[PDB]
C-alpha cells in the first residue's frame, strides 16, 4: 500500500492531491463540531415577518414584548 | 405484388451491411527557405 502511494506520488501528484482534497471535503463535515452552528445561523435569519399569535389565555412560553425574557436567545451568535 | 414504381427495388443484403462506397495533403510554399509537401492523417 505504501509502495503504491509513493509510486502515484512520484508519477501523478496532481491526481493524488485532487483525491486527497476530495476525501477531506467528503469526510470533514461529519467530524467538525461547527456544522450545527451553521444550521442555527441559517435558522436565525429573519427573512419573513414574525406574525404574532392571538392570546387564547394560556401561552406561558411565548413572550408579550420583543424585549421580554421569553422566546429564543441569541447570545451564542453574539459570542461564538 | 410488384408494380411499375417498385420495379427497381432490390432485396436487402443478408448481413444488412452495405458496401462502404483519404489522406490530407498540404503544400507549404516558400513564403533559410524551404518548400514542404506534407501528407497528414488528421
Amino acid at each position: 500500500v505504501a509502495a503504491f502511494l509513493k509510486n502515484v506520488w512520484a508519477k501523478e501528484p496532481v491526481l493524488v492531491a485532487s483525491f486527497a482534497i476530495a476525501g477531506l471535503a467528503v469526510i470533514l463535515p461529519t467530524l467538525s463540531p461547527y456544522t450545527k452552528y451553521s444550521l442555527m445561523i441559517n435558522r436565525a435569519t429573519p427573512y419573513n415577518y414574525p406574525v404574532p399569535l392571538r392570546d387564547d389565555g394560556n401561552m406561558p412560553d411565548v413572550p408579550s414584548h420583543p424585549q421580554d425574557p421569553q422566546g429564543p436567545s441569541l447570545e451564542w451568535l453574539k459570542r461564538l | 405484388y410488384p408494380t411499375k414504381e417498385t420495379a427497381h427495388w432490390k432485396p436487402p443484403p443478408w448481413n444488412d451491411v452495405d458496401p462502404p462506397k483519404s489522406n490530407l495533403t498540404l503544400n507549404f510554399g516558400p513564403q533559410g527557405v524551404l518548400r514542404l509537401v506534407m501528407e497528414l492523417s488528421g
Binding site: 482534497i21 476530495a22 477531506l24 471535503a25 467528503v26 470533514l28 451553521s38 445561523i41 | -
Partner: protein
C-alpha cells in the same frame, strides 16, 4: 448626463489599449537587453498615434470572402462584447450596478467566440477555418474551467454581485484562502485571450489574416481591451483594495496600480516561455486543471458548512 459617463468609460479604454501596445513594446524590449520605440516621440509616446494613422490609410485587402455579412459582423461583435463587458466593473462604483454581474461577464465570455467562428468561416481559406476551430475549442475549454473557478470563489463570496467582492475582502485578500484557484484562474484567463504561451495562430494559420488593416486593428483593440479587463477582473476578484466611501480615489488608485502590475505580468509571461502545443494545452486543461478544479469545488462547497462561515445572501 449618463451618456457622459458612458463616453468617459469607453474612450479611455481605447487610449489605454493604444498605450498598452506602446507599453508592451517598451517592456518587452527592455527585458531582452534592448530598447523599445524612443525615436518617433519623446520616449516613443507618439508611436500608437503613428501606428493608428498608418493602419487607417493602408489599402484594404478586399479578400474573396464566401460571405460578406459574417466578414463585417465579426469585428462588430468583437468590439461590442469587448466594450459592453467593462460596464459592471466596481471601480469602486460600477456604471451599471447589477445583481448578477459575474454571470453577465461569463455570458459575454461564452458569447465572444462567435467572432472567431465567423472570421474563420468568412475567409475562403480552409486552413484559416482549421485554425479558427482550434482556437474556438481552446476558448470553450478554458471557459469551462473559468466557470467552475468563478463558482467556487463566489460560493466563498455568497452572491453574484460584483460590488460585494469589495465588502467580502475588507479584512484579508481572497488570494490567501484561494491561492490554487488564483493560480489556475490566472492561467485560464491567460489561455482565454490567446495570450502567450497559449497562442497558436502565430505559430505553424491565422483566422484573421484575410482581414484588412482596419478590421485587423479593430480585432487588436478588442483583444487588448479583453486583456486589460481580465486583469482588472482578477484584481477585483482576488486582490481587492481598501475602499473608503468618502474618498473613492484611494480605491481607484490602488486597484489601478494592481491591475497595471498584473498586465505587466502578462507581458512578462509573454517573454519567458516557449509556445505550447495544441494537444499539450488540451492535456493541461482536461487532465491537470479539471480534476483539481472539481476537488477544490467540493472543498469550497463543504468548507463554509463545517466552519460556520456561510456568508450572507445580501
Amino acid at each position: 448626463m449618463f451618456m457622459i459617463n458612458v463616453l468617459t468609460l469607453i474612450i479611455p479604454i481605447l487610449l489605454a489599449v493604444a498605450f498598452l501596445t506602446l507599453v508592451e513594446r517598451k517592456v518587452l524590449g527592455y527585458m531582452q537587453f534592448r530598447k523599445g520605440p524612443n525615436v518617433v516621440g519623446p520616449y516613443g509616446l507618439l508611436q500608437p498615434i503613428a501606428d493608428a494613422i498608418k493602419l487607417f490609410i493602408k489599402e484594404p485587402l478586399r479578400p474573396a470572402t464566401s460571405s460578406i455579412s459574417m466578414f463585417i459582423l465579426a469585428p462588430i461583435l468583437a468590439l461590442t462584447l469587448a466594450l459592453t463587458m467593462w460596464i459592471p466593473l466596481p471601480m469602486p462604483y460600477p456604471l451599471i450596478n447589477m445583481n448578477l454581474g459575474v454571470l453577465f461577464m461569463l455570458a459575454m465570455s461564452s458569447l465572444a467566440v462567435y467572432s472567431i467562428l465567423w472570421s474563420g468561416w468568412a475567409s475562403n481559406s480552409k486552413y484559416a477555418l482549421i485554425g479558427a476551430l482550434r482556437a474556438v475549442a481552446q476558448t470553450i475549454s478554458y471557459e469551462v474551467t473559468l466557470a467552475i473557478i468563478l463558482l467556487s470563489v463566489l460560493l466563498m463570496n455568497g452572491s453574484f454581485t460584483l460590488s460585494t467582492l469589495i465588502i467580502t475582502q475588507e479584512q484579508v485578500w481572497l488570494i490567501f484562502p484561494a491561492w490554487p484557484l488564483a493560480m489556475m484562474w490566472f492561467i485560464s484567463t491567460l489561455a482565454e485571450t490567446n495570450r502567450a504561451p497559449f497562442d497558436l495562430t502565430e505559430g505553424e494559420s491565422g483566422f484573421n489574416v484575410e482581414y484588412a488593416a482596419g478590421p485587423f486593428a479593430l480585432f487588436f483593440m478588442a483583444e487588448y481591451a479583453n486583456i486589460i479587463m481580465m486583469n482588472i477582473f482578477t484584481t477585483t476578484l482576488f486582490l481587492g483594495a481598501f475602499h473608503n466611501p468618502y474618498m473613492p480615489e484611494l480605491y481607484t488608485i490602488n486597484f489601478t496600480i494592481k491591475s497595471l502590475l498584473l498586465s505587466i505580468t502578462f507581458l512578462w509571461i509573454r517573454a519567458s516561455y516557449p509556445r505550447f502545443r495544441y494537444d499539450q494545452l488540451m492535456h493541461l486543461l482536461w487532465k491537470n486543471f479539471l480534476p483539481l478544479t472539481l476537488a477544490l469545488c467540493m472543498w469550497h462547497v463543504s468548507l463554509p458548512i463545517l466552519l460556520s462561515s456561510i456568508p450572507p445572501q445580501t
